[PDB]
Structures are given as structure tokens and as C-alpha cells.
Curated annotation (Swiss-Prot), chain A:
Region called Framework-3, residue ranges: 61-92
PROSITE patterns: IG_LIKE
Swiss-Prot/TrEMBL keywords: Adaptive immunity, Disulfide bond, Immunity, Immunoglobulin
Protein name: Ig kappa chain V-III region PC 7043
Protein's GO biological process: adaptive immune response; immune response
Keyword Disulfide bond attributed: yes
Gene3D superfamilies per record: Immunoglobulins
Protein's organism: Mus musculus
Complementarity-determining-2: annotated span: 54-60
Chain residue ranges for the region called Framework-4: 102-111
GO CC annotation, single: immunoglobulin complex
Disulphide bonds in the chain: C23-C92
SUPFAM superfamilies referenced in this protein's UniProt entry, alphabetically: Immunoglobulin
């Protein structure tokens, strides 16, 4: 089997800049003067999208910002200028021989201006409590960079376990991330405390963003 | 427009087998080869094999010879793939594609089929609405949430207002608490909308034909 090594693995690039992804086939993928290497774009949640086929052909409908090059065993995909809708994982795939092979992929992240998350905390729904469960949910929307912390405080003290965080992939419209944290306790543990705080921190800093509520 | 419609998700017991379909339209079914790719959680694509709709010709990636079994049905322009003796490794997403336009690659793809190989029983989700609870309400945006917790297996489709609301939505990826799944979605709307105009969240869990419409009230 032929090995397709993509490089780099991850790459951050500011809007308008240039993005260059490499692909190195272990063998040659030329055949009668044509290099059979294709490139796909894949945004989280959907099937890959054919961008460029046979090394340098831009599929009809693809923005001219994209452009492939290379031959033999070394190929390159070029994006200029980079846009918000480009944050995705990219793949080169050889069609030269059995079995068809895909590259190890390259995630493309967009750099932008630091942005504060929009925290919103939610107490447990009556429905949920009735069944002996209490899930406090905290939404930290549209922040940047992806590196953020979330500390949960119950009656002043920090709650360690019972937390479940889930990040969103970088937005296609504004290049921001979002995260959801859920502190899950039992109706008993919940009913025996009053103040529930959810606070976010950006890497180091010191000035957090808090949100809280009282059981009344 | 060439169109490839793949079957719904599947939860299969390990050791068993499963068959998925891929309905083609918008083109001469026999003219083009039908190809199959598998992609796994951590994301990484693998070619399974191709099939010649015309004569039932078949091409298999050595790894999948014996595991996959491509088949086709001319009269219905439908492609089939059968996976035998499933094991947890076979838990992934399978796409069917074709080279309409002869780009010598994979030009068109289906939307995928998620197969979960597991001895576990399917558990429906518990849909809980998330309301602010006596908060802001004066020309200032308001965030609402819907918590979908304790379900199995993946996936679940959350929607806001049958789909009228697409902007402001943020559906987070499911996490695995215990041996169950939990995800949540949020939607930001102008103070005008709610509580005035109705805001519902519609959760659907295919594996169990579970359809819920929880209304977000204050």
C-alpha cells in the first residue's frame, strides 16, 4: 500500500494570508504525464468535498482561491486568500493504484481577534428534578482562542467532579469557538445548597467572567 | 443534480451483520462505478471497494475482502454494502460515492451512515428545556437551551422550531457519561422573540423512533 504523508498536521493562519498544505506520496503517482492526486475539504459533520483533482485541476464551482501543484511524489495545496469558510480538515488522495489512499489530514484554524465568551447559566428544569436529577448547564458562546477554563462553584466552594464539557468546532462565519459545561448532581445534593456559579478564565489572566443564580 | 441518498443509522450486535443502501439519482446509474469509503471517529478515510452497476463488477481493498460485500440493483438505481461478522472496529461512518464527471477521484458523496456495533440496548434521550428564569428582557439578546441527556446510541437530531431558527444555534458534540450519551443545544434570540413568539426544540433519536418537541417557557 502507498502511504500519503500530509504536513503540517495543524496550522493557524490569519484571514487574507496564505495557507500551504503539503502531501508526500511514498511512491510516484504519475501515469502518462498526469499526476493523480486529489484534494478534499471536510467541514465537521459532512462528507468530504472534492476540491482539486489530478494534481492541479480546480473542480467546477470551487473558488479560485484554491490551487494545487506538484507532481511525482510531492504535492501542495494553496489557499489564497484565506477566508472564514476555510476552517476545515484537508486531505490529499492518490488515485494512481490499488488501493486508493487518503492523507493523514491537516486541520486549518483561522486566527482572529481575542473575543470574550457569552456566558449563560441554567438551573435544572422542574421536569428533571422530579426524577431525582439536577443538571446545571453553562453555555460559553463565541470566544477565542479555544483555550478557556470553566470553574464551577457551589455555595462559594469549587466543585471538581460531575462536570461535562463539550467544545464546538471553529465557526464558519466568525471563526469563533463555543463550549458547553454541565455540572451534574443529584436532586438531594442540589437541594442542599443555594448559590451555583459558573466562571470562565482565558488561559492565565486573572479577571474572570462569572454568572450565577440562587435556588430562589 | 447527482444525488446519493444513504440509509439511516444502525446499531448492530457484535458478531452479527448489517446491510446499508445508497440510492442514486440525477444520472445514468450504470454509467458510473459506485465506490464505498469508511471513516472512523478520530476521522480518517479508507477506501472499501467499488462496484460496476452494469455487470456487478467488483473491486475490493484487500483489508475489506470478505468483510464487505458490495451489491447493486439496476431497477432501483440502488447500491448495497453488507458488512459481515461485525466487531467494534466496524463502528464508523460509511459513505458511498461516485465519479460522475470523471475527475478520477470521488466527486459526489452520500451523507453517510453511522454504524455502531454494540451489545448494548438502545436508550431514548431525556429532553429537558433550559429557560433563563426571570432574567433580562429589553432589546437585549436572550439565550435558550435544550438538554438532551442519557441516550444511546448516536446520533440525535436537535432542531429549533422545526428549522425556522438556524441562526444563533449551537449544537454541541455528544459526550459519553457512563455508557450513555449527552449533548445540548442552545439558541440565541432577540428579547422580542421570546417569551412572545413560541420557541420549541425538536429532538429526534432515530435508533428508537423517539421524537420530542419540548417548548421553552419561563
Amino acid at each position: 500500500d502507498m502511504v500519503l504523508t500530509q504536513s503540517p498536521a495543524s496550522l493557524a493562519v490569519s484571514l487574507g494570508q496564505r495557507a500551504t498544505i503539503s502531501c508526500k506520496a511514498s511512491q510516484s503517482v504519475d501515469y502518462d504525464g498526469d499526476s493523480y492526486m486529489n484534494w478534499y475539504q471536510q467541514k465537521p459533520g459532512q462528507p468530504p468535498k472534492l476540491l482539486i483533482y489530478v494534481a492541479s485541476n480546480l473542480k467546477s464551482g470551487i473558488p479560485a482561491r484554491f490551487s494545487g501543484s506538484g507532481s511525482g511524489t510531492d504535492f501542495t495545496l494553496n489557499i489564497h486568500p484565506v477566508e472564514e469558510e476555510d476552517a476545515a480538515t484537508y486531505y490529499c488522495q492518490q488515485s494512481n493504484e490499488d488501493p486508493f489512499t487518503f492523507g493523514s489530514g491537516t486541520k486549518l484554524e483561522i486566527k482572529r481577534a481575542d473575543a470574550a465568551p457569552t456566558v449563560s447559566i441554567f438551573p435544572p428544569s422542574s421536569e428533571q428534578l422530579t426524577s431525582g436529577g439536577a443538571s446545571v448547564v453553562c453555555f460559553l458562546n463565541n470566544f477565542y482562542p479555544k483555550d478557556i477554563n470553566v470553574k464551577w462553584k457551589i455555595d462559594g466552594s469549587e466543585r471538581q467532579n460531575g462536570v461535562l464539557n463539550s467544545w464546538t468546532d471553529q465557526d464558519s462565519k466568525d471563526s469563533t469557538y463555543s463550549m458547553s459545561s454541565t455540572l451534574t448532581l443529584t436532586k438531594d445534593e442540589y437541594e442542599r445548597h443555594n448559590s451555583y456559579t459558573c466562571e470562565a478564565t482565558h488561559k492565565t489572566s486573572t479577571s474572570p467572567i462569572v454568572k450565577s443564580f440562587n435556588r430562589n | 443534480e447527482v444525488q446519493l441518498q444513504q440509509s439511516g443509522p444502525e446499531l448492530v450486535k457484535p458478531g452479527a451483520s448489517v446491510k446499508m443502501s445508497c440510492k442514486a439519482s440525477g444520472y445514468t446509474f450504470t454509467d458510473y462505478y459506485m465506490k464505498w469509503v469508511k471513516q472512523s471517529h478520530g476521522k480518517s478515510l479508507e477506501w472499501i471497494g467499488d462496484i460496476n452497476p452494469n455487470n456487478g463488477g467488483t473491486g475490493y481493498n484487500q483489508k475489506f475482502k470478505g468483510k464487505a460485500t458490495l451489491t447493486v440493483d439496476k431497477s432501483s438505481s440502488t447500491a448495497y454494502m453488507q458488512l459481515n461478522s461485525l466487531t467494534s472496529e466496524d463502528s464508523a461512518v460509511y459513505y458511498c460515492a461516485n465519479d460522475y464527471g470523471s475527475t478520477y477521484g470521488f466527486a459526489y458523496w452520500g451523507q453517510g451512515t453511522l454504524v455502531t456495533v454494540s451489545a448494548a440496548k438502545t436508550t431514548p434521550p431525556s429532553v429537558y428545556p433550559l429557560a433563563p428564569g426571570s432574567a433580562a428582557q429589553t432589546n437585549s439578546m436572550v439565550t435558550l437551551g435544550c438538554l438532551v441527556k442519557g441516550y444511546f446510541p448516536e446520533p440525535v437530531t436537535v432542531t429549533w422550531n422545526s428549522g425556522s431558527l438556524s441562526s444563533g444555534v449551537h449544537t454541541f458534540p455528544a459526550v459519553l457519561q457512563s455508557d450513555l450519551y449527552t449533548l445540548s443545544s442552545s439558541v440565541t434570540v432577540p428579547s422580542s422573540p421570546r417569551p412572545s413568539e413560541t420557541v420549541t426544540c425538536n429532538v429526534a433519536h432515530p435508533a428508537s423512533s423517539t421524537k420530542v418537541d419540548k417548548k421553552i417557557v419561563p
